[PDB]
């Protein structure tokens, strides 16, 4: 291969430098330069110590950048003991799911009269009939208690502040605009603030200087963490070593002697070699894995050397960390980020397999996960970075560094350095949006991802080394290492594809969800909150050409209810069709293997558009929502005739034409589709052979049944419309009494008018039905489905908001 370029050395140096800026590693140099009136100090020896809060010279805002295990919680309790003058002093402590409040609430046994809001079952609150006074909260739950907070507090604590600010960008975030304004009001008005994170950065210090001026901010920088039981040492391994894995997992029956390959060690230090050495040597080990796919493989490998291997991921029952002392090997994925830490001196070493992926965990999540085991008896942490999946050129380019350093550390909010109003958050949301964006973008590139992870380890005082460079690494050495890793990672994929666990206990729903194709599919058609097992059930249905056709029809109908100009402009319809009804979709075949399928484009969409126009109006009239299960209204055979009769002969003509289409124009007019529609019409009673209602119900049932897979099911409802008996409001009761001209206003009260209907219920008996959407199809984004924006939602907004301009125009 080619020798290392000077450009490769500048790429490296730029990536490291931007990583250092994003997580606050530059803070001691940047503060004096850019905010000269803000005081700063560094504490390199022993635990951190915050300023004496009772002194008149102690500033209103203090911000702390100090390691996990630097003594922060002890310095905070000391600072609160000094800050709190009286029981009349109010206090607010905000935290996050990433670092549970229960640890603070436990250690705060040291302080009088402080309590925490239960994020579960928040009723029966301790400060009953009063606003909260001395309170611990998690930001993810803050909107629940916002109206029962004091308007202002005497002390504000933000713990893991960058993790707190990170929640604003989560898809689960709720009442965002309120939580923005609430936090901003507290920041602008509390007379003492303390804000702490291992990664508190220049933009936080800038923001607090913006709200309160340099002379009221102080910064303290920790560069010490507790030795001994927490003196962790990290090693990046060069090679996965699947040649050992495949030889171990080999069936023991045949002799199967070795081929003349993998004879040289190629720098050895394999992930699997090093792991086997610990397992054979009798060590207790814990293994983080980014992917379930690999977690299952390494569990199989561990189950050869031991019996007692625990495996934890989202689709396993949640094992509490107290149980982990029972096992020789514990394998987990990022799910333990939601749970508590494991404290006991049980494990000798830790292994980690990290694979950046566009829809994967971010490196800051990975770091959180690696921390969940607090204590390691031998102090080893071995990391393998799988760069297949992440083979792109860097995002932390020299151009971006030159930009950011020119603007005094002010980052661009998106990768084009020199925008449209696609979001509308407040000061807080806009200030830190850059950090969320680069945490997700850099996953595209292994070099950037590695540099971020290395930065996070270094800022927490973990000594990081790379194999064969066990002192310090020059840019050329890094580029050689990283070049080697990309090659190893790329060749190992075939071994991991061969070894992919397909025994019944191996989770196909989890393994499917780690595929990029599935993430894209989910992002375009489906709701974000659907379970992987629901998706596999849909993808199995999509494998059949009939199931796939019905899926696309149903997704088009939903688009037409979301974009009502699609029902009117053929031009807009062609944009919606090209987007939702052409391209590639993931399916699962009968073997259980994931398999992509093309949706061929259609030259003439006119028959489809006419049909969906008709069906969209009748869908709207029946209050259709696939997510809600189908039709909101009940309807009877008379309503069916009323729905069809305005355009009856068009429905007849279009279903006939679809049954006899001369050309196989794309997906929806393929041979099986037109055959099925013809077969359906061959069974339909002729237009004069039965009552108008009988023919109308037959036709309606064929349209909904064949095209969308939607069943006209009989209803047990006592009364028409949407209303269940027990939920019937007074206004709807009056409507029902008037609809039959029943006696009215005997009394004004609900219970009287209810008692009338419950006597006259027999007058409301009859044939009654609902449209039911199939089992799949309930997981689709619909007009009712609230969702944070993406490319598809914004495209539909554009198609709704912007009109078609006249083309060949005159000046």
Partner DNA sequence: TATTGGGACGAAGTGCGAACGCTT
Partner DNA sequence: AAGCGTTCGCACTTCGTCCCAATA
- C-beta of 613: minimal distance to a copy of itself in Å? 7
Nearer to DNA, 67 or 774 (CB): 774
Binding partner of residue 520 among a copy of itself, DNA, none, CB cut-off 5 to 8 Å per kind: a copy of itself
177 is a contact residue toward a copy of itself (CB under 8 A): no
416 is a contact residue toward a copy of itself (CB under 8 A): yes
245/298 Cα distance (integer angstroms): 9
- C-beta of 360: minimal distance to a copy of itself in Å? 6
627 is a contact residue toward a copy of itself (CB under 8 A): no
Tokens 């992917």 locate to: 291
Nearer to DNA, 596 or 713 (CB): 713
- C-beta of 784: minimal distance to DNA in Å? 15
337/365 Cα distance (integer angstroms): 7
Footprint (CB under 8 A) of a copy of itself, residues 635-654: 645-646
Nearer to DNA, 345 or 747 (CB): 747
With CB under 8 A as the contact rule, which of the stretches 45-53, 155-163, 414-422, 481-489 interacts with a copy of itself?
A: 414-422
Nearer to DNA, 294 or 635 (CB): 635
Binding string to a copy of itself for residues 287 to 306, with x set by CB under 8 A, is what?
--------------------
428/760 Cα distance (integer angstroms): 59
Nearer to DNA, 487 or 764 (CB): 764
Binding partner of residue 711 among a copy of itself, DNA, none, CB cut-off 5 to 8 Å per kind: DNA
Binding partner of residue 650 among DNA, a copy of itself, none, CB cut-off 5 to 8 Å per kind: none
Binding partner of residue 129 among DNA, a copy of itself, none, CB cut-off 5 to 8 Å per kind: none
* Residue 171 in tokens: 């898809």
Query: Residue 718: phi, psi to the nearest 5?
Result: -70, -35
Binding string to a copy of itself for residues 598 to 617, with x set by CB under 8 A, is what?
xxxxxx---------x---x
Cα–Cα distance list, 355 to 226, 228, 333, 558 (Å): 29, 30, 12, 36
455/23 Cα distance (integer angstroms): 8
* Residue 677 in tokens: 């529609």
Footprint (CB under 8 A) of a copy of itself, residues 352-371: 358-362, 365
371/347 Cα distance (integer angstroms): 13
420 is a contact residue toward a copy of itself (CB under 8 A): yes
Look at the alpha carbons of 258, 261, 265, 271 in this order and tell me if their dihedral is positive or negative.
Answer: negative
First to last CA, the chain: 59
Burial 317-345 (b: 16+ CB within 10 A, else e): eebebeebeebbbbbbbbbbbeeeebeee
Binding partner of residue 758 among DNA, a copy of itself, none, CB cut-off 5 to 8 Å per kind: DNA
Footprint (CB under 8 A) of a copy of itself, residues 97-136: 97
Torsion of CA 104, 106, 107, 109, to 10 degrees: 130
Please say whether the beta carbons of 62 and 478 come within 8 A: no
Q: Which of 14, 58, 67, 53 is nearest to 39 (CA)?
A: 58
Which of 41, 265, 578, 738 is close enough to bind a copy of itself by CB under 8 A? 578
Nearer to a copy of itself, 318 or 775 (CB): 318
Nearer to DNA, 527 or 730 (CB): 730
For 723, residues 6+ apart whose C-beta sits below 8 A from its C-beta are 729, 732
Nearer to a copy of itself, 424 or 751 (CB): 424
Footprint (CB under 8 A) of a copy of itself, residues 373-412: 392-393, 395
Nearer to a copy of itself, 5 or 344 (CB): 5
Binding partner of residue 422 among a copy of itself, DNA, none, CB cut-off 5 to 8 Å per kind: a copy of itself
286/565 Cα distance (integer angstroms): 56
Footprint (CB under 8 A) of a copy of itself, residues 316-345: 334-335, 337-338
Count of positions on this chain that bind a copy of itself (CB under 8 A): 93
For 420, residues 6+ apart whose C-beta sits below 8 A from its C-beta are none
Footprint (CB under 8 A) of a copy of itself, residues 241-280: none
Nearer to a copy of itself, 565 or 678 (CB): 565
Please say whether the beta carbons of 140 and 175 come within 8 A: no
Binding residues (CB under 7 A) for DNA: these are: 629, 711, 713-719, 724-731, 748-751, 758, 761, 770, 772
Binding string to a copy of itself for residues 501 to 540, with x set by CB under 8 A, is what?
---------x--xx-x-xxx-xx----x---x--------
Please say whether the beta carbons of 734 and 675 come within 8 A: no
Nearer to a copy of itself, 55 or 603 (CB): 603
Torsion of CA 283, 288, 292, 298, to 10 degrees: -20
CA angle 244, 248, 250 (to 5 degrees): 115
690 is a contact residue toward a copy of itself (CB under 8 A): no
Residues listed for the chain:
811
């Amino acid at each position: 291969g080619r020798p290392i370029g000077d450009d490769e050395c500048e790429q490296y140096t730029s990536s490291v430098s931007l990583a250092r800026m994003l997580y606050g590693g530059d803070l001691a140099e940047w503060v004096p330069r850019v905010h000269p009136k803000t005081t700063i100090e560094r504490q390199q020896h022993g635990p951190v110590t915050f300023p004496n809060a009772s002194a008149p010279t102690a500033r209103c805002v203090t911000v702390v950048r100090a390691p996990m295990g630097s003594g922060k919680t002890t310095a905070l309790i000391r600072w609160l003991r000094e800050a709190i003058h009286s029981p009349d002093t109010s206090v607010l402590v905000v935290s996050c799911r990433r670092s549970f409040t229960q640890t603070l609430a436990t250690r705060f046994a040291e302080s009088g009269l402080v309590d925490f809001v239960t994020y579960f079952s928040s009723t029966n609150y301790i400060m009953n009939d009063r606003p909260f006074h001395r309170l611990i909260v998690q930001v993810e739950s803050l909107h629940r208690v916002g109206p029962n907070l004091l308007n202002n507090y005497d002390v504000l604590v933000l713990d893991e502040v960058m993790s707190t600010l990170g929640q604003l960008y989560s898809p689960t975030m709720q009442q965002l605009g309120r939580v923005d304004a609430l936090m901003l009001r507290l920041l602008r008005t509390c007379p003492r603030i303390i804000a702490m994170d291992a990664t508190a950065n220049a933009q936080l210090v800038d923001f607090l200087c913006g709200l309160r001026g340099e002379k009221n901010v102080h910064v303290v920088v920790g560069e010490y963490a507790m030795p001994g039981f927490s003196a962790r040492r990290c090693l990046f391994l060069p090679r996965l070593g699947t040649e050992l894995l495949q030889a171990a997992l080999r069936p023991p029956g045949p002799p199967s002697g070795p081929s003349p390959d993998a004879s040289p060690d190629a720098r050895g230090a394999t992930f699997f070699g090093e792991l086997e050495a610990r397992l054979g040597g009798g060590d207790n080990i814990c293994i983080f894995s980014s992917t379930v796919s690999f977690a299952e493989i390494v569990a199989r490998f561990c189950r050869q050397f031991t019996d007692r291997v625990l495996l934890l991921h989202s689709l396993t029952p949640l094992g509490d960390v107290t149980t982990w002392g029972q096992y020789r090997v514990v394998i987990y994925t990022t799910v333990v980020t939601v749970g508590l830490s494991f404290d006991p001196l049980h494990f000798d070493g830790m292994f980690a397999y990290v694979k950046p992926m566009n829809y994967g965990p971010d490196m800051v999540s990975v770091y959180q996960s690696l921390g969940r085991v607090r204590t390691l008896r031998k102090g080893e942490l071995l990391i393998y970075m799988d760069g297949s999946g992440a083979r792109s050129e860097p995002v932390f380019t020299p151009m971006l560094l030159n930009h950011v350093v020119s603007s005094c550390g002010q980052w661009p909010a998106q990768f084009s350095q020199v925008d449209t109003s696609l979001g509308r958050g407040s000061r807080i949301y806009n200030k830190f949006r850059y950090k969320h964006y680069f945490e997700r973008c850099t996953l595209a590139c292994l070099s950037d991802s590695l540099n971020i992870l290395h930065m996070l380890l270094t800022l927490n005082c973990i000594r990081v080394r790379f194999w064969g460079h066990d002192d310090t690494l020059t840019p050329k050495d890094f580029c050689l290492f990283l070049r080697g890793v990309h090659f190893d990672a790329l060749r190992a994929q075939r071994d991991l594809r061969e070894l992919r666990c397909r025994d019944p206990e191996a989770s196909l729903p989890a393994q499917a969800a780690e595929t990029e194709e599935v993430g894209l599919f989910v992002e375009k058609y489906l709701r974000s909150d659907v379970a992987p097992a629901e998706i596999v059930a849909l993808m199995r249905n999509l494998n059949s050409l009939m199931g796939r056709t019905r899926f696309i029809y149903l997704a088009l109908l939903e688009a037409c209810l979301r974009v009502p100009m699609a029902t009117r402009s053929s031009a807009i319809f062609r944009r919606i069709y090209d987007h939702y009804a052409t391209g590639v979709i993931p399916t699962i075949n009968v073997t259980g293997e994931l398999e992509l399928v093309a949706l061929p484009p259609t030259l003439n969409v006119t028959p489809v558009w006419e049909l969906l126009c008709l069906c969209s109006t009748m869908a709207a009239r029946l209050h259709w929502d696939s997510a809600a299960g189908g039709s909101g209204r009940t309807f009877g055979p008379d309503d069916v005739l009323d729905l069809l009769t305005p355009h009856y002969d068009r429905y007849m003509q279009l279903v006939f034409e679809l049954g006899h289409c001369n050309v196989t124009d794309g997906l929806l007019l393929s041979e099986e589709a037109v055959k099925r529609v013809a077969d359906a019409l061959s069974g339909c009673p002729p237009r004069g052979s039965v009552s108008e209602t009988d023919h109308a119900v037959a036709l309606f049932k064929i349209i909904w049944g064949e095209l969308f897979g939607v069943q006209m099911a009989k209803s047990t409802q006592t009364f028409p419309g949407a209303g269940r008996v027990k939920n019937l409001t007074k206004q709807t009761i009056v409507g029902l009494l008037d609809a039959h001209h029943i006696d009215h206003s005997a009394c004004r009260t609900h219970r009287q008018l209810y008692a009338l209907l419950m006597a006259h219920k027999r007058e409301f008996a009859g044939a009654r039905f609902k449209l039911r959407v199939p089992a799949w199809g309930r997981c689709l984004r619909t007009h009712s489905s609230s969702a944070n924006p993406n490319a598809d939602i914004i495209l539909e907004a554009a198609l709704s908001e912007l009109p078609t301009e006249a083309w060949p125009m005159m000046q």
